[PDB]
Amino acid sequence: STIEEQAKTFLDKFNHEAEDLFYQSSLASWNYNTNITEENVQNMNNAGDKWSAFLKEQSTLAQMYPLQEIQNLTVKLQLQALQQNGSSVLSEDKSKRLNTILNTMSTIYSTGKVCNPDNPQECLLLEPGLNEIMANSLDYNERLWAWESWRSEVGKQLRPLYEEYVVLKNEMARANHYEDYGDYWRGDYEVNGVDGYDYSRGQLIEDVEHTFEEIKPLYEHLHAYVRAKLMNAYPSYISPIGCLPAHLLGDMWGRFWTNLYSLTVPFGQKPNIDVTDAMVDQAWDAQRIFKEAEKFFVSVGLPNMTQGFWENSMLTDPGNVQKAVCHPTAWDLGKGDFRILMCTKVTMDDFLTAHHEMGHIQYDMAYAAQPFLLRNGANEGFHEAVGEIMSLSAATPKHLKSIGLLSPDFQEDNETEINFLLKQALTIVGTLPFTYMLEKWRWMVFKGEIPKDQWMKKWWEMKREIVGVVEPVPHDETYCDPASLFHVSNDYSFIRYYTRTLYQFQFQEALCQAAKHEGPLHKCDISNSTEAGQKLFNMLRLGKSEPWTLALENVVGAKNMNVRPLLNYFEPLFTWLKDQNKNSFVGWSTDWSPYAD
């Protein structure tokens, strides 16, 4: 009768039919990624297109149930995705061309390559090849050759594709009553219909900006620390108060500095925490890595893993005949069938990735009791954050010595922790300003504040100001840096990494209050404490059926992101970087350039 009763009738029947197709859509998508066959590539596209068009066919009857006459929060949040009609709100021309743009940018991203000037017969693909060379190369010219020539053949080719990427996505957002496509992902955090818990879309601009200011004192000391070490390597192109070259950042696009740890080692005479060689002594294999990971989830108070999870998991790649993607990924299928696609070697990172990939499933099993349209992460940042919170305490010497990996003779002090914290900092600290930079620059271009000619003018200007990075080769508006990103070309959220670090450290800190751990965060171990999984499972089971600020408040008690857990986790490093930077200049200046003398 009423709109609340009419829509609930449509949403109850839709949850049954959508769960059947989406599960078969992800099942065919799972079977192909793990095993390469000609039958699975057809079933993946067929089942993927059926469920994609199934929501478009049902959205005609779903858009007739407005959210103003419905007082149920669940019914409104389920129709929120069905109210968006996808390609239907766009015109026939703008909808079909948009799919071509997103597919062409992915083809250029996958099939792009940069040939070696020294070896004309050797041309390395982007992934892994160009990302691997930029990872391990310490040379100035060897990095710049593949760094500049890429955006010439690729980045310049992706400029007209990025032009349609800004216009065609804004037409869909404006049809959804959104300001721009930059607000489309600002609508991922959008909350309406609850008194006091509503979240403003424009508030996210101030939210990530207020957090980045608190990241500055931790980042200024590390950026000046890395710049001081790289100054002795290239005194001509690197100023002590200046900015670092863009091709020396340690990888292709500048995402992670992790591979610069070798030069930045705090103490060469002190050990660091590594379980890679320890797993060799304990003799644990891919079957025992997830086996020892389930015992951790049971001890902390989280639900166990079903036999179908551990038996049907994909632990490696059985050659080229049936090929499995080695990039760690956790696919959510449905009906209690959860699996993880990863190539498992013996390393310290694979053990941390084990709790990371299972953390997705650990979150997936929590909300399985919710309706299908209510089955999802509350945002795009909570997906990857729930995995890391289990790996933060798993790398602690308390749990490692309890399971036997880390030898008890290992000395744990300030010298040994700073070595391990800095190795993880370049993965953590290095990501935050670069990620806050790229998404903020997209919000301005999608809005129109930046003219087409100033795209790179504002990009490199905001790059010297935010991450303190200057270009070796000046780029005009013809180049486009963000278009080559995996998230932008594939229409994915790249800001999830900036929010994860602030989400993952909050989720870890608050559980340490129930785990009876105080002081720095890395010294906290949630193992054997059952109250950790009890307070965590209550948040993980809600999903997006409740406001993401509400579920966040149920644990840390805060409605926004906070940098305080980032400070105390690196506190031994933050106080150590301040001591080493006394002879250098904290911060950076935007007036230095390697090609300007």
Binding site: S1, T9, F10, K13, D20, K335, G336, F338
Partner: protein, 97 residues
């Protein structure tokens, strides 16, 4: 029964009644396929806006989760009426002396 009543590709043989205009009484079996009318839009056995087919088929495959796995349930209804009792419990005989 997940190794029996479920198969690859789904098992549509087992259905259920998702929608009904009211709640059934105990020991009441209703096979009516009549379309549930959610709103004031007329249905009369014709699908459309606020007209939805109540019966739904369970997705059954061997990979389903434990809570979602198909289970064969046999409910034993014990009814004592005024008529004399027929079915009795087991009688186990012993040796004779």
């Amino acid at each position: 029964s997940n190794n029996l009543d479920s198969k690859v590709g789904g098992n549509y043989n087992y259905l259920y009644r998702l929608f009904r205009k009211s709640n059934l009484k105990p020991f009441e079996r209703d096979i009516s396929t009549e379309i549930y009318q959610a709103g004031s839009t007329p249905c009369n056995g014709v699908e459309g806006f606020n007209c939805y087919f109540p019966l739904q088929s369970y997705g059954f495959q061997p990979t389903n989760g434990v809570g979602y796995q198909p289970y064969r349930v046999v409910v034993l209804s014990f009814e004592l009426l005024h008529a004399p009792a027929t079915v009795c419990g087991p009688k186990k005989s012993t040796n004779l002396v």
